[PDB]
Amino acid sequence: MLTMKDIIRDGHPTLRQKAAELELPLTKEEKETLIAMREFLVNSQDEEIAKRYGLRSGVGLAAPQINISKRMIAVLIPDDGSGKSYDYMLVNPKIVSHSVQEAYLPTGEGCLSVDDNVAGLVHRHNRITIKAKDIEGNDIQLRLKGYPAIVFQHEIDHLNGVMFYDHIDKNHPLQPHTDAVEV
């Protein structure tokens, strides 16, 4: 199983690479790492197993963060109120379309690869559409609004070597952009 000593840290140059597109079907090794990625999130969201392996809680993980410069991500966003959950393992994900309307988390964002908390808003597209491949090479099209949209944008950002904190306005970090929804 993956643990925190697998996650590489801010300053590591793999995080600033642009990750390569995978050929299909995937290799057994590639499937294993994507499955594990998911298992990490699951594990980090169990209070006992996180206690035991000192896992920080995660809802998203990009392969670059375990130092694998390939275009795959996992997302595991448990129910939390509404009856929507999000358990996706995606290969070569791509945002094909999005809203003009931006959204943001009022308390900013976090990143497993980052150890300081960093205050500042990260404006994102409130709605998105992603085309991707699943772990068996079948086709996925996701329509996402709100928190999931942000989460998946966060992880996609990782594949282009973009960190959430690059989106912070230097001089007015807590200033909402006009007409942006708070999530």
Ligand SMILES: O=C(O)C[C@@H](Cc1ccccc1)C(=O)SCC(=O)c1ccccc1
């Ligand atoms: O480090 C990562 O890339 C994963 C990260 C992504 C993230 C996206 C959008 C906003 C904040 C962070 C996290 O999953 S941080 C953990 C988290 O937000 C959480 C987990 C369980 C319960 C409540 C919150």
Ligand code: NI
């Ligand atoms: Ni991150």
